[PDB]
Amino acid sequence: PGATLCLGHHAVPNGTLVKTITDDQIEVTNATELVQSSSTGKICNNPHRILDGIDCTLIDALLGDPHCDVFQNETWDLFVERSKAFSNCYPYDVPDYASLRSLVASSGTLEFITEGFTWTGVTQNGGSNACKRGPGSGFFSRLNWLTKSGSTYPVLNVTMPNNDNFDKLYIWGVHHPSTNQEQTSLYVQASGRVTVSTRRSQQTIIPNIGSRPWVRGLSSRISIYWTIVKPGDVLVINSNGNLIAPRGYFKMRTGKSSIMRSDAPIDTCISECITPNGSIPNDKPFQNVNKITYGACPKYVKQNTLKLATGMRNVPE
Amino acid sequence: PGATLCLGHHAVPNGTLVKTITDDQIEVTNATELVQSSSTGKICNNPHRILDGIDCTLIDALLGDPHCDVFQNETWDLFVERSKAFSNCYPYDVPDYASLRSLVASSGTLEFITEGFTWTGVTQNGGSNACKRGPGSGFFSRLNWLTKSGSTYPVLNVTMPNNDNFDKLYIWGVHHPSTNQEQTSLYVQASGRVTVSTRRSQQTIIPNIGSRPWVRGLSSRISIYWTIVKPGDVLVINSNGNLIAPRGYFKMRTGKSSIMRSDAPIDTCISECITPNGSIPNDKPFQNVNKITYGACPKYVKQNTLKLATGMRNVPE
Amino acid sequence: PGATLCLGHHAVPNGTLVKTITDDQIEVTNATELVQSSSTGKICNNPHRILDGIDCTLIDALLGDPHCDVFQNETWDLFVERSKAFSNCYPYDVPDYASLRSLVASSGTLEFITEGFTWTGVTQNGGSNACKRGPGSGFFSRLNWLTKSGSTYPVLNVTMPNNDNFDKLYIWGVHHPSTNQEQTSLYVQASGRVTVSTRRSQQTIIPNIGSRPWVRGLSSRISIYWTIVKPGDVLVINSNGNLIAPRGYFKMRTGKSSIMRSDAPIDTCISECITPNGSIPNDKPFQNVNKITYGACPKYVKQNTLKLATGMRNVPEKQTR
Amino acid sequence: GLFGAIAGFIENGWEGMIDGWYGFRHQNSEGTGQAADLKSTQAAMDQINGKLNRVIEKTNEKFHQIEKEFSEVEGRIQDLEKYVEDTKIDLWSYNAELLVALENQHTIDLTDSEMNKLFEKTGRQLRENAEDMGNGCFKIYHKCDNACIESIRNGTYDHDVYRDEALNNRF
Amino acid sequence: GLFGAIAGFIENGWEGMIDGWYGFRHQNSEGTGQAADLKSTQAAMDQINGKLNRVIEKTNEKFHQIEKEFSEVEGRIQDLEKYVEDTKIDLWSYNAELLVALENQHTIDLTDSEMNKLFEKTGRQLRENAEDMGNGCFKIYHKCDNACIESIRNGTYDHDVYRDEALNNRF
Amino acid sequence: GLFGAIAGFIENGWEGMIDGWYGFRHQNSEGTGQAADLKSTQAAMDQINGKLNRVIEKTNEKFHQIEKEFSEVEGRIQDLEKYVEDTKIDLWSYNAELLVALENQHTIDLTDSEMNKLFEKTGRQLRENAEDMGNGCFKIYHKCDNACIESIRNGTYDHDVYRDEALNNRFQ
Ligand SMILES: *[C@@H]1O[C@H](CO)[C@@H](O[C@@H]2O[C@H](CO)[C@@H](O[C@@H]3O[C@H](CO)[C@@H](O)[C@H](O[C@H]4O[C@H](CO)[C@@H](O)[C@H](O)[C@@H]4O)[C@@H]3O)[C@H](O)[C@H]2NC(C)=O)[C@H](O)[C@H]1NC(C)=O
Ligand SMILES: *[C@@H]1O[C@H](CO)[C@@H](O[C@@H]2O[C@H](CO)[C@@H](O[C@@H]3O[C@H](CO[C@H]4O[C@H](CO)[C@@H](O)[C@H](O)[C@@H]4O)[C@@H](O)[C@H](O)[C@@H]3O)[C@H](O)[C@H]2NC(C)=O)[C@H](O)[C@H]1NC(C)=O
Ligand SMILES: *[C@@H]1O[C@H](CO)[C@@H](O[C@@H]2O[C@H](CO)[C@@H](O[C@@H]3O[C@H](CO)[C@@H](O)[C@H](O)[C@@H]3O)[C@H](O)[C@H]2NC(C)=O)[C@H](O)[C@H]1NC(C)=O
Ligand SMILES: *[C@@H]1O[C@H](CO)[C@@H](O[C@@H]2O[C@H](CO)[C@@H](O[C@@H]3O[C@H](CO)[C@@H](O)[C@H](O)[C@@H]3O)[C@H](O)[C@H]2NC(C)=O)[C@H](O)[C@H]1NC(C)=O
Ligand SMILES: *[C@@H]1O[C@H](CO)[C@@H](O[C@@H]2O[C@H](CO)[C@@H](O)[C@H](O)[C@H]2NC(C)=O)[C@H](O)[C@H]1NC(C)=O
Ligand SMILES: *[C@@H]1O[C@H](CO)[C@@H](O[C@@H]2O[C@H](CO)[C@@H](O)[C@H](O)[C@H]2NC(C)=O)[C@H](O)[C@H]1NC(C)=O
Ligand SMILES: *[C@@H]1O[C@H](CO)[C@@H](O)[C@H](O)[C@H]1NC(C)=O
Ligand SMILES: *[C@@H]1O[C@H](CO)[C@@H](O)[C@H](O)[C@H]1NC(C)=O
Ligand SMILES: *[C@@H]1O[C@H](CO)[C@@H](O)[C@H](O)[C@H]1NC(C)=O
Ligand SMILES: *[C@@H]1O[C@H](CO)[C@@H](O)[C@H](O)[C@H]1NC(C)=O
Ligand SMILES: *[C@@H]1O[C@H](CO)[C@@H](O)[C@H](O)[C@H]1NC(C)=O
Ligand SMILES: *[C@@H]1O[C@H](CO)[C@@H](O)[C@H](O)[C@H]1NC(C)=O
């Protein structure tokens, strides 16, 4: 009269499916999800410094569109541009908009330092009814619309050396009149020119006269350009008309700053990873929420689910 | 008086060598090839819509070079440009040719909608012997060479609003004469200008007078430009000479369309994957035929062969 | 009274830790390092042809800055630009500097072929005190500063067809004077223009008059451009002022050539793989020395160490000590 | 699995075992019973936790990157930006798929291996006093009271004590 | 392989076995013969088909991409376009090489494992009525007519029937 | 490991064995001794050398590439150049990490497997003349002089010779 001793293993009534080398679906006792597929819908305001652009693009805040004046000298880890943002100043374009937006976003600051440029023999501080300030006409806060003094617009020739230990970002522009009447009326000369240079490089822009669609009352336009001046280098600006002058420079940093397009509201919570859909947790190695991310994020993948088996094969009774 | 029961496994007289983690060559009973290394030499005409360019580049078909008129309003999933293609119209360049070619290829259509532009006080429908259309002189079908009427070329100022719910692509140009004689003879004014603008952009081009190398009788050239007009926006064209005007717009789409350079002939057969060498089957996960592909294709790799073992280790005798 | 037969395996006194699927640290009898993390500090002079730029950037050697004349007609597999390099000729910029530098570096040669351009009715061989060649004024060796003859600068219209079976690279420029006084004094006309064209392409540059920062005595500048002319095509240069003319073309090649920024000294030794830190051996599959490499190199990775187990799991006898 | 215990010679698992992953069922003189084997349960769990913690090692912190969505058609530069991102995503998606497949195959095989290891440890403990029925169960050829079963389970079973009794019952 | 059956304790394969991957050769009273084991053959094939179908999963369909051949020298933008494609191709080439190496090592090990599984299943069926010669063959210690062999092969061999006979022939 | 010999039923390794990776310790009539098993040692080494030579296969040679360090801020084009390189490096770093982890797990398992293979080969040689103690050791149930041990080790042990003697010592 003996005894029987049986070896065995556990099972559960309802297991989970995983993929292996040999099977697309095989049932195991337990598994854990490796793809983050959900978000709160909200961008957490810690631990990164979030700056809500509200009605303003970064570029409008950079240039100093009046409704964006509140952003003067603002800093961020992540600037958030909203789909409702609008421009409300002189109509303008930026050749290479994407790059200017990128480098400013990356600098992480709009900190501006006024410099005493000497514009001999021109009128400063031009304004337009397209860019209202208070009861009167106005202009971008960081730019200086220069026009004739009396009946002359001389050759403007100014220099500003960089004796600091940081990069200087200068924003400047060129005015494109709609008629010859307005070109000569504002700048005397029939054809302007703007030349902005450092020791090793230069940009020269010829203005373009001609009629364009009405924006905020105007057929004329400004084109925006930038020049970075490194420590020990020097800025020179040379122009016989159509210069939209800088008033100074923006102080550049390097660091972790960026920019994101999103309409997700900002909330008081803590999340390392931010997507345009909102913040997501970063406990899982992969995510399917959005390929656009900022912070300590799971890597984006196309799969909405991937299961890591955390137990043996399930063979129920 | 007993019995012997032997356990064993099969073998074959001629096995195949494969690679493993530990051996670069070891023999197994069977294997299957994972790299597609051959092609038919022929591009299958299904299931993708293939459009054989024959003698025409996409850009020549876009502009409407007379030998390319058969492509008017065509559509494609894959446009196939041939090395024998040639231009036979006004000599031209496209600044950023590669981008225009890309965006058109990707739109997948040459569908063109004529618009009633009003060119007040100039002659329309200019032609050249370098661009014959039937026996007489001609021009690109989608462009309108404007020249003086009598002895004047007035300032042209025209508008075309986009009141549709789709994007409009406008193709236009600027004429670069070889001599001052030609400039004033065609456009009266000694120096032309072309300004094409929307609310959101503007391009102004000054023509350049001078000789270029002789092409089909001509040392003059045309430069081609493009402007996209979004719903609710408005096209303005302003010019006192040298305008090569649009006759309308191309309708833009997004989808699966592309373009490929190939001399492989087109055949009546079915293949999801197309390379310049011809169609290839897509049953294998990798291919070594060409890194240029279109469709459901194996991924390109450098190896010409990789064997997946489909049986046990082969130990003959 | 029988016998006992025990099976076993070795162990060693000092094993190494490795990573596996299940453990980030577990001990094995031996392992080998897969990440190359050190360099000699020196670029080996074989088997690749290394050309030390010394005081010269590739572009200054291309244009023919006098202190770079020693590089005339040089070739390289790897051109090495040094942080001490300086320019000492007419101040200039290159729109798309990075591309010109890239394509020249890649061609692997500065081989130059002089062509008999006919510049009718202008003065050739202009020089500047900013670009001394011996004791007197000079210019870039591969460029020809053209100015008025007597009191006229005619419309220049010249052609150079390519009837060879190789590509020609032409380097040319446009002069940007600082004042109107200088413009008209040198080129007569108040506004220059340079148009350089082949059958399918053209570049037109209008000079810009104005000051730039003072460099070696000058607030004027030259801007450098390039044009490649394929076999059967033709170069046309058309200008009524401000042309800095080519003297010829550079022969283009394709091959394994490149360029690297480095201050590592060049030494007599043999290494397939070169980094800016110096040469590194290529026996290991990965390296953490520099993401910039040239030659048969391990792939760059972020880890400074990765250990491949070359023996069994190491299990010493546990002690009561 | 590679060892052929789980979903092999052991017909199925035990839903009733909720205090461990592997263990013992016995029938003896005094009735039936069940106990978890802690050591083999722990080995499996510990290996699985080890691999879980390797896979969830936080390794990616990225700040300013490229744009990945575009409001305007641009051509060449945008084609490249998109192609770069789409290449990246495909390569990481592949890594993720391969990772789980290798990990999961290995998890199934190590759990199968732990079962088999417990079965052999037990067989070796019982020396000549028992026989492998071939279905995960040993027939023990002697009187094995509840004290004797616990001795097998808790690792203290002296086989010499029951050997003569058992040898005779077998032969 | 990891289990040491194929190219291990089984000296070689059988070219003569063409109706299965694993099986049985016997010598008894009535002569010699051969049969395939279907179950173990099927397990191996099913696992290999499973992995084949995973590897050949059509998983990419690409349309407009970047240019990858160029007729003109351009510099910076073209350098990047080429470098992006060459990076991609190297990464996929590596994936492909690793994939086959892992797959093939694993295929060799699972086929070795199925052999070993059949050998142990058989040993366990035969209980004390046979002995492992150590070369893949069991010496059976009783009269085993062709009916008895088929009983071992088709899974119906009652060992108790032949046990007394066999125990005595052994000892 | 998957086979449970090394760091399993074999309590530990032998620091004293310096002429091989696997082998034999015996106690008999004439005292104690030790010998390496050459075949199993060779199988393990050969597999490990095989995988080492696969991993160190020199297989990339690159010449002109993109710039990877920049002295000027430029924006869009530079962002992409950097992102391309950083993407590449992350993917290769992952490949390298996975490779060693898979290789090392496999190396541990094949070495464990070779131990187990030697243990079973030996058990099968000894037929009914010995018993598995469960700790890596066989109790042999007959007189086994140094000649008999070498016969087990060098593969020539005829079990039939000692079977009657041993069968009787086992069963009482
Ligand atoms: C447009 O604006 C700028 C700024 O006002 C102006 O450029 C400046 O001109 C002066 C005078 O030519 C430059 O002065 C030089 O400075 C360097 C130091 O970095 C010195 O090495 C030079 O010294 C020698 O040369 C002089 C001859 O002019 C001698 O007087 C002197 O004793 C030395 O021998 C020299 O003084 C100055 O560097 C530039 N600055 C910049 C940033 O360019 C430019 O000339 C104006 N243009 C017009 C048309 O007015
Ligand atoms: C070259 O051509 C252009 C088009 O013919 C000329 O531009 C037009 O100029 C007139 C006046 O000179 C503008 O008239 C003004 O328009 C507003 C309305 O503007 C828009 O807003 C409303 C909604 O708020 C919308 O419904 C309209 O469709 C408009 O888009 C009127 O309310 C005023 O009365 C005002 O006078 C035109 O708007 C303007 N059109 C465009 C498209 O720019 C241009 O002057 C010509 N140039 C030359 C040198 O002759
Ligand atoms: C500027 O310089 C170039 C070269 O000196 C001139 O271009 C050349 O113009 C002539 C005609 O005047 C072209 O000749 C033609 O050749 C065809 C055969 O190819 C022949 O059948 C015709 O009868 C005619 O003779 C010549 O090809 C062309 N050369 C090039 C390289 O394009 C140009 O005319 C000069 N312009 C001025 C204003 O000086
Ligand atoms: C355990 O693995 C290590 C690797 O981490 C082995 O060390 C390496 O051993 C060889 C010699 O056996 C050395 O390679 C040789 O180097 C000499 C000059 O040093 C050269 O002339 C030969 O042609 C050959 O390349 C190597 O330097 C050495 N590396 C290190 C980092 O120590 C070690 O031998 C292995 N131990 C055992 C017991 O297997
Ligand atoms: C498919 O076409 C490509 C492109 O023409 C072929 O590649 C060329 O052929 C040989 C190498 O096989 C070289 O001499 C050329 O330089 C290759 N060019 C390129 C761009 O790789 C390719 O071999 C063809 N393959 C098949 C299977 O037809
Ligand atoms: C090789 O050189 C590289 C690049 O010069 C070195 O890495 C830099 O070292 C500094 C510290 O001096 C770090 O703060 C930087 O982050 C590194 N720069 C870059 C661009 O990565 C590297 O340490 C050197 N390696 C060896 C082995 O010499
Ligand atoms: C499944 O696995 C995870 C991680 O190992 C664990 O948190 C969870 O509790 C497990 N679930 C069950 C039902 O055991
Ligand atoms: C996140 O946002 C994108 C873009 O708006 C959308 O396509 C995607 O499906 C969203 N996913 C989740 C999980 O919210
Ligand atoms: C290899 O592949 C298939 C079986 O899957 C078959 O058609 C072919 O005959 C096989 N070859 C050999 C030698 O087994
Ligand atoms: C092009 O598009 C439409 C047809 O849908 C029509 O307006 C036009 O007449 C067409 N012309 C040609 C030549 O196909
Ligand atoms: C450069 O090479 C060409 C021919 O190969 C020759 O005519 C020319 O004089 C050479 N110059 C130098 C400095 O070697
Ligand atoms: C298996 O073997 C016996 C004896 O050869 C045969 O008669 C029988 O029909 C077979 N199987 C079953 C399930 O009956």
CB atoms within 10 A of CB E56: 16
- Is residue C272 within 8 A of residue C222, CB to CB? The reply is no
Q: How far is the CA of B258 from the centre of ligand 8 (A)?
A: 27
C-beta of C74 in contact with ligand 11 (< 6 A):
no
Cα torsion E106, E111, E116, E119 to 10°: value is 170
Pocket of ligand 12, candidates E28, E125, E154: which has the most ligand atoms within 8 Å of its Cβ, to mutate? E154
Distance set, CA F17 to CA B26, F39, F42, F136, F150 (Å): 32, 15, 15, 16, 17
Distance CA B211, CA B217 (A): 12
C-beta of C120 in contact with ligand 3 (< 6 A):
no
Distance CA C210, CA A206 (A): 13
Minimum Cα–Cα distance from F65: chain C residue: C258
Contacts 24+ apart (CB under 8 A), F77-80: F77/A99, F77/D77, F77/E76, F77/E77, F77/E80, F79/A102, F79/D64, F79/D65, F79/D66, F80/D66, F80/D77, F80/D80, F80/D81, F80/D84, F80/E80
Question: Coil, strand or helix: which one is B102?
Answer: helix
Strand B143-145 and strand B243-246: pairing?
A: antiparallel
Ligand lying closest to the C-alpha of residue A276: 8
Question: Coil, strand or helix: which one is A22?
Answer: coil
**3-state DSSP helix/strand/coil percent for chain A, to nearest 5?**
10, 40, 50
Region label for A312, one of left (φ > 0), alpha (ψ between -120 and 50) or beta (otherwise): beta
Distance CA D60, CA D55 (A): 13
Tokens of C257: 């050539």
Identify all chain C residues contacting D110, using CB atoms and an 8 Å cutoff.
22
**3-state DSSP helix/strand/coil percent for chain B, to nearest 5?**
10, 40, 50
Tokens of A81: 């541009």
Identify all chain D residues contacting F3, using CB atoms and an 8 Å cutoff.
113
**In the 8-state DSSP scheme, what is residue B314?**
P
Alpha-carbon distance A26 to nearest alpha carbon in chain B (angstroms): 21
| Contact at CB, A312 and D44, closer than 8 angstroms | yes
Largest CA distance in chain A: 126
Tokens of B27: 């023999």
Phi, psi values for residue B116, rounded to 5°: -80, 75
Name every residue whose Cβ is closer than 8 Å to that of residue D135 and which is 6 or more positions away in sequence. D9, D10, D11
Please state the separation of Cα A118 from the chain's center in Å: 31
Tokens of E69: 């051949």
Region label for E57, one of left (φ > 0), alpha (ψ between -120 and 50) or beta (otherwise): beta
Contacts 24+ apart (CB under 8 A), D73-78: D73/B103, D73/B167, D73/B228, D73/B252, D74/B99, D74/B103, D75/B96, D75/B98, D75/B99, D75/B100, D75/B102, D75/B103, D76/B96, D76/B98, D76/B99, D76/B102, D76/E77, D77/B99, D77/E77, D77/F76, D77/F77, D77/F80
Phi, psi values for residue A97, rounded to 5°: -50, -50
Kindly tell me the sign of the dihedral angle through the C-alpha atoms of C256, C258, C262, C263: positive
Distance CA E79, CA A45 (A): 40
Residue type, D139: K
Between the two ends of chain A, the Cα-to-Cα distance in Å is: 29
Mutate to test the interface with E, among A7, A20, A22 (most CBs of E within 10 A): A22
| Contact at CB, D80 and F76, closer than 8 angstroms | no
Tokens of B315: 């130990």
Distance CA D28, CA D34 (A): 12
Strand ranges inside D49-92, DSSP E: 61-62
Identify all chain E residues contacting A303, using CB atoms and an 8 Å cutoff.
none
Counting from 1 in the atom list of ligand 8, the atom nearest the Cα of A41 is: 14
Q: What is the domain-level CATH number for residue A83?
A: 3.90.209.20
Distance CA B73, CA B78 (A): 15
Distance set, CA A242 to CA A205, A209, D11 (Å): 10, 11, 89
Tokens of F121: 């080969």
- Is residue D34 within 8 A of residue D13, CB to CB? The reply is no
Q: Can you give the residue range of the structural domain that contains D59? A: 1-171
Counting from 1 in the atom list of ligand 9, the atom nearest the Cα of B14 is: 13
Distance set, CA B238 to CA A181, A192, A209, B204 (Å): 16, 19, 9, 9
| Contact at CB, C103 and E75, closer than 8 angstroms | yes
Q: What is the domain-level CATH number for residue F128?
A: 3.90.20.10
**Angle made by CA atoms E93, C105, C128, in degrees to the nearest 5:** 160
- Is residue C224 within 8 A of residue C96, CB to CB? The reply is no
C-beta of B211 in contact with ligand 3 (< 6 A):
yes
Name every residue whose Cβ is closer than 8 Å to that of residue E82 and which is 6 or more positions away in sequence. E68, E70
CB atoms within 10 A of CB B184: 16
Kindly tell me the sign of the dihedral angle through the C-alpha atoms of B229, B235, B239, B243: positive
Q: How far is the CA of C283 from the centre of ligand 4 (A)?
A: 12
Q: Can you give the residue range of the structural domain that contains B157? A: 49-264
Tokens of F3: 């086979």
Resolution in Å, one decimal place: 2.5
Distance CA B152, CA A229 (A): 49
Please count the structural domains in chain E.
1
Q: Which residues pair with B6 in a beta bridge?
A: E25, E137
Identify all chain C residues contacting D103, using CB atoms and an 8 Å cutoff.
21
Nearest to A167 among F73, F75, F79 (CB): F73
| B263 part of contact set with chain C, CB < 8 Å | no
- Is residue E148 within 8 A of residue E157, CB to CB? The reply is yes
Q: Which chains touch A (3 or more CB pairs under 8 A)?
A: B, C, D, E, F
Roughly what angle, to the nearest 10 degrees, separates helices F76-125 and F38-55? 170
Strand C266-270 and strand C43-46: pairing?
A: parallel
Residue owning the nearest CA to atom 5 of ligand 7? A310
